[PDB]
């Protein structure tokens, strides 16, 4: 049987069969529960059902910053992924799961236990997202800036060797930019407070927000013109209108101090990840920055990333930012390649081998 | 045995057997007592007998604004409902009673005690009228504007969940419009003063009154034409003739300030009930306004309700007012459906369980 | 023992035993005393003896307008009623006496005292004449126009409830029409002056007088033809001849201004009695006008009464005047029914109860 | 010129000049017409002339229950008010007329037309009687119980705002108590029947009748003593003597069921008028009951009114009944104040403005 | 001249002169307008005048949730604050205004424009309420839980640095607890509906309501004893009696789900505000919770707040809740300190500087 590839991100579940070139099931990775008692019935809703029904539900994300915080809701979301969205018996297919680097070891151990004991999967693996995202680009060398809903991380790879000491990780990604857009929308007098209202602010961010190429020149232009200012229609048909908020939101990727986060931005953390590498590989990394995940989808993000890294880099270096179309799925496409390589079929952790060695056996290639 | 469904409204008793699609007994819910001593004998008359005999009687309504104010007259009206109008032993049939939301808890408790101890009913329930009225329409989602003789209330329901915080209630309905029509009839020189004369003014209201689509354009037209002006023949064969009074009466549903009532009208209280709901359900509520009860029967009431809510609503929303024929009975038809559902037979409060838990057990699904 | 029923009217005593359908004793209710001394002996004559002997007597009526004005003559007339005309021991039979409404309370009290202390009657009652007259018709609803020798009164009754506030009473009846016929006979040159001559004018009225259907068309016809003109033979065999006097007399029932009486006529007082009633009963009263007593016996009185009330009534109403044959006795026939009802035997005022409670006990159902 | 103030009540015309503190002309408001033809001449008499001459006249009141029922007799009574009793050219003085609340609109319209077109008055107003009666007391807040010959009405006013929804009106006042005293006088054997005899019964009521503080204790005392029993001398010098009739008459203000009137009495209608008001003003109304008009003049009426309202009121409230001396004129004194206020001269409806706007302009402050 | 300090809260205006230790003017911040037309005059009433007169008025609050929704009513309330309650020329005194955090920027801009252009104030500032409330306590470090009529917000401050990212704001405060107490009073059969009746429910809440230390043990005790049950006398002297309603009301601060509000309660939002802070300051915040504003005045609120935060906190931490007497004014007392500091006189926005820089200049220290 062909393998399942389940990217299982913190803000979308992306799942499908290895060798397909887009995921079959892509759904919100939310569990919702009724706020109000029924008078007229399903206790909880998962994914797109909890989006369609979201006004009456509190929405929980069981994954935050790539760490599974509620396990019973994650077992619901996996159960729906296999039985309802893929419509597959999971005990017949090896499943390539996926994780961020530098997660707690217990997160991978308890995930592996749930796969072998609840779902009875025959064989399993857990890849690092930014390794897979490099397979999707075809490259063997590059520094992969992957930024999802939960985590941003740089993994530098050179000719197929990882550099574990150079892996950087930011707990700043799409959800922290939703939580910040809600605060700067509050300055126009738009108040969003419910978990179900944050799912509206997310669609605002996904439609209206872009990256300013020169932040303080856009701040001047929005302070002098309403050409930057656009409108958006709520599910109620009320119309909100937002201005410099359109680029002040993604700017928080480059100035995390906006959210009170003491950190380098994604430019300085990418340059620092490059600078922790040996001088000889550094030129090959500069020419192969690979962007992936949804938070790299903002209009003009690569165009500014190139000009910030060019400003940090020594001026002889060619800086190139490889941000392909469909970089939103490149972690899943990379896993869909990997799971179908003949060289990889050696690496599946088999059920027998997990019954033998226990949860020790799961970190054999782990960061 | 099949259940009894007793809508037991403040201005009509509607009662029958579950699974029938119209009530058997529909009678005025009045107790009358002789004003004059007999010289020529029944101490009190109930319902249609107190209408036929009404000239010699003072008529009391034992229910006002959905609250049972005289219990001995309510025990008379129930006794006649069971033994004379349905001709049924009540101790053999479970009875679905009915109530407005936000009534005093003691009203339901003392009603339940009278059913279990006087009439010895085997099992009982008390539904909210606007839940039932949604079952009658078949819909699982909508905002139900129910307006009887005593109470107007909006109950919003979304996919079978109630939203208790959004339930609105107006103490303004058909009886307050009778009491106001008597005052504006007094301007033509028609004086109605007796309780038995108000039962004439009620039939005037039920026959001649309609809703003006543009109130101040009808007020101009009645100020310039006698095409709006109609006549009506009293029980004495005297002829009265009424003009802008025909629409100034129901207008008090939309401008309660006419009766010195500080309130939103039924349009603004329906829109406010919609606006207390989460933005996601709001579009589904706008398309499913359900009208019910007798005070929604005026010609053109839905046609104006649609155009007032369209004026408050944001202009992208489809506004639809589902006002079916027989909406005068839809509370009873809803209860006649509910009482016959297999899923509902779990919910009957049994006599044994009331002897066990006391009047605590009666509010388990209550607003 | 069976009860005595004594109608004891102001111009005839009608008396008999309950359950008979005509009175046994019907006699003039007159006491006469010799005008001239005897030379050739009874001091006073009562009833038919004072009619046979009337030329030598002054005739007194002890009742005027239903009020007993001379009590010693009323005790004579009762004594003759019991001992000579019925030939009954009064102390063995309960006696249903009778009265007009709105009489002085003392009239009923002193009548009751005379029955309990002179005649020693065991039990007694005093009914209102127009209640009894409705029992005679069998009806439970109607407005009873009773017109005797002394009083005209309307009592409206609806389904066995009296309406005390709507009871009307006219001090205009058969004796005032005798006194007016004597004045308009004086215009033909016939002078009647003695009390014994008024008993001739009464028989003229009872034989020749009728009700004109259109008074001023009969006045024209009598002014142009002697077809309306009839003759009558006195006890002396002298012949008098009377013309428009035949209908100008009863017309005084409809235009009391002829006798200088400021009043509505019997049509307008019947319509006014109907109009003091609640609108709901009014239609049932219009269809059930019941005529009774001797002054309703004129030819064509119901035929004009119907056409005057039809002229006052609103044109949709059915007006019907129930004037049966034997309406001259219907007060007595009603009392003869009432006294024989089992439900009524509760109501006799017993001698013991009068000795206990005094003359307070006599007005328990009184107008 | 100073204004005329014409209270124009249903049982007295009270008229005078604004700024005087008692009316000049106070006369019966009666038109009388000869019952009998002249043989020895004025066709009709008005006011005090129709009282002095009343034995030969039928007396009509052109106003009944505050509604002008005969307009030609009302134009006679106004003509005599201006030309004979005030001796004034009406076309030189603005006239403050007066009305009850809740009268037919046509009554005020036809009154205004008669003033502008027959009498040619320059400017006119029509005040509500119970507003004026509050100006007479000086108070800005209170509930005014005004009871005349035709109407009783409560108008609650709080700090100079009327509460139209709380205005109560009873068609029960001094004339209905004359018509009831004639019926209970008939129980002593005194029969009053002529319109001119009712003007005797009125003076009996005005002299002998009082309010019992505890009705059934006075009924017991009159049933046991002749200390409550007084005598009165007719215009014929005949002496009548009346007992519990002295207080059973005014008691009909508190138990209207005595006249077959289904209603609250003046205590319960005053308390109900207070209870239709918002809770915050209610304490200020309880302390400021203002009595006015002639039917409040009975000895002890305020003393019982205070003790009935104290019995209905919640026991913490101070109840005070402000019944001043000269409350018989306080409607006219209030109008005499109002007409002389500078702030009021804005409000006169001018002849020019009535020719412009028609009878629409007359209800600008109307109930 | 000394500065004015105007706290200008959503439910009270508190105003005075800097350096005084209690405000001079404290008044309701209400504008009321007559519901009824005058017949006997001020178009609108402000503050304590609209409380004294409230029965006849609709009351509007121009501030809701700290946002000024009606500007013309806010200009009335400021005009009365300066000219009538303080009796001061505002153009001679710099005025420290005040605001909640995270308000719309336009609210502060339009407030500043009204001060500089209508009232012509020479210099102005707008402080954050929870900064001021810390100055009142004297502390330089603490987390300030301020809860007024409109907003609850936590502002954590450490040694005089704010932590903008940790500022939490709840749209749940005293007015939402009045609106909820009206709904749970409706369960005893007490219906409060008018805006003027909500001002009665507010005084019920302020007198009878307290915080249960163990909510479900008080719910059991009130379900078993009437020792928790107290009575209160309306302005009408009617007596209402309320039981578990006394603590179910304030419990909505801790379980907002009672009002259908998806939120943490004030305990969990205070703990979450502490947890968004860096670990080193967290111990210093736990020992310095500062309570302020009126909704913290309930008996026992600090005693439960301490025991909920102790339950969330890690057990080694000292938790202390600094809830001083007069915490109801501590925002104003803090502003009265701040306005008198010499170091602060640098910070006044001068009129000249506002004419120069425009409404940009107003957010220089803003959240
Ligand atoms: N086109 C877009 N523009 C901006 N942001 C986006 C876009 N698509 C997704 N995002 C944001 O990125 C996150 C989803 O990224 P994704 O890579 O799907 O996450 P995951 O790795 O959890 O699947 C969300 O925060 C979403 O708001
Ligand atoms: N066809 C009609 N048109 C207008 N009003 C009506 C009509 N039918 C009933 N009503 C009014 O509505 C009330 C009766 O409504 P209903 O729904 O039967 O009340 P309940 O819920 O008490 O049974 C009465 O006030 C009646 O006057
Ligand atoms: N057939 C008749 N036609 C006209 N008048 C009659 C007739 N019979 C009796 N009356 C008159 O009516 C009165 C008697 O009526 P009646 O009902 O017998 O009186 P009472 O009620 O006193 O018995 C007398 O005035 C008599 O003249
Ligand atoms: N002193 C009095 N005692 C009792 N009743 C009186 C007195 N004065 C007048 N009335 C009665 O009140 C009515 C007159 O009241 P008034 O206020 O003058 O009426 P109007 O408002 O029509 O002028 C009449 O019915 C009269 O009988
Ligand atoms: N002693 C008290 N007990 C309970 N609640 C109170 C008390 N005093 C005021 N409140 C409530 O708190 C709010 C007023 O708080 P306050 O701090 O004065 O508000 P603002 O910040 O708007 O001035 C009102 O809702 C009032 O009902
Ligand atoms: Mg991902
Ligand atoms: Mg109903
Ligand atoms: Mg008779
Ligand atoms: Mg008057
Ligand atoms: Mg505040």
Curated annotation (Swiss-Prot), chains A, B, C, D, E:
Gene Ontology terms, MF aspect: actin monomer binding; ATP binding; calcium ion binding; calcium-dependent protein binding; cytoskeletal motor activator activity; hydrolase activity; identical protein binding; magnesium ion binding
Keyword vocabulary terms for this entry: Acetylation, ADP-ribosylation, ATP-binding, Cytoplasm, Cytoskeleton, Hydrolase, Methylation, Muscle protein, Nucleotide-binding, Oxidation
Domain of life, source organism: Eukaryota
E.C. code: 3.6.4.-
InterPro entries per UniProt: Actin (IPR004000), Actin/actin-like_CS (IPR020902), Actin_CS (IPR004001), ATPase_NBD (IPR043129)
Residues modified as N6-malonyllysine: 53
Residue span of region Interaction with alpha-actinin: 102-115, 350-362
GO biological process: actin filament bundle assembly; actin filament polymerization; mesenchyme migration; positive regulation of gene expression; skeletal muscle fiber development; skeletal muscle thin filament assembly
Recorded catalytic activity of this chain's protein: ATP + H2O = ADP + phosphate + H(+)
Modification note: MICAL1 and MICAL2 produce the (R)-S-oxide form. The (R)-S-oxide form is reverted by MSRB1 and MSRB2, which promotes actin repolymerization. Can be mono-ADP-ribosylated on Arg-169 by SpvB of Salmonella spp. This modification blocks subsequent polymerization and leads to cell death.
Entry-annotated residues carrying Methionine (R)-sulfoxide: 40
Record family assignment: Belongs to the actin family.
Subunit details: Polymerization of globular actin (G-actin) leads to a structural filament (F-actin) in the form of a two-stranded helix. Each actin can bind to 4 others. Interacts with alpha-actinin. Identified in a complex composed of ACTA1, COBL, GSN and TMSB4X. Interacts with TTID. Interacts (via its C-terminus) with USP25.
Physiological role: Actins are highly conserved proteins that are involved in various types of cell motility and are ubiquitously expressed in all eukaryotic cells.
The protein, known as: Actin, alpha skeletal muscle
Organism: Oryctolagus cuniculus (Rabbit)
Gene designation per UniProt: ACTA1
């Amino acid at each position: 049987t062909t393998a399942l590839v389940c990217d299982n991100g913190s803000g979308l579940v992306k799942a499908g069969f290895a060798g397909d070139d887009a995921p079959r099931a892509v759904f919100p990775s939310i569990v919702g529960r009724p706020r109000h008692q029924g008078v007229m019935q399903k206790d909880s809703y998962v994914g797109d059902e909890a989006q369609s029904k979201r006004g009456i539900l509190t929405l929980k994300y069981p994954i935050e910053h790539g760490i599974i915080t509620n396990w019973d809701d994650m077992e619901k979301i996996w159960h729906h992924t296999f039985y309802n969205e893929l419509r597959v018996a999971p005990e017949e297919h090896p499943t390539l799961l996926t994780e961020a680097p530098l997660n707690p070891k217990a997160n991978r151990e308890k995930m592996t236990q749930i796969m072998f004991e609840t779902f009875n999967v025959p064989a399993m693996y857990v890849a690092i997202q930014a390794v897979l995202s490099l397979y999707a680009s075809g490259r063997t060398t590059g520094i992969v800036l992957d930024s999802g809903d939960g985590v941003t991380h740089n993994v530098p790879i050179y000719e197929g060797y990882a550099l574990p000491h150079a892996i950087m990780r930011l707990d700043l990604a799409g959800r922290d930019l939703t939580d910040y857009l809600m605060k700067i929308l509050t300055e126009r007098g738009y108040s969003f407070v419910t978990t179900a209202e944050r799912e509206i602010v997310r669609d605002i961010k996904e439609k209206l927000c872009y990256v300013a190429l020169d932040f303080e020149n856009e701040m001047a232009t929005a302070a002098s013109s309403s050409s930057l200012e656009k409108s958006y229609e709520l599910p109620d048909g009320q119309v909100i209108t937002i201005g410099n908020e359109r680029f002040r939101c993604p700017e928080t990727l480059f100035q995390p101090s906006f959210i009170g986060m003491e950190s380098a931005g994604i430019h300085e953390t990418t340059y620092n990840s490059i600078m922790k590498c040996d001088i000889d590989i550094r030129k090959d990394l500069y020419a192969n920055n690979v962007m992936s995940g949804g938070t790299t989808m903002y209009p003009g993000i690569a165009d500014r990333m190139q000009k910030e890294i060019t400003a940090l880099a020594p001026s002889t270096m060619k800086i190139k930012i490889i941000a392909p179309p469909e970089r939103k799925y490149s972690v899943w496409i990379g896993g869909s390649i990997l799971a179908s390589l003949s060289t990889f079929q050696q690496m599946w952790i088999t059920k027998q081998e997990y019954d033998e060695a226990g949860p020790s056996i799961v970190h054999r290639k782990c960061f």
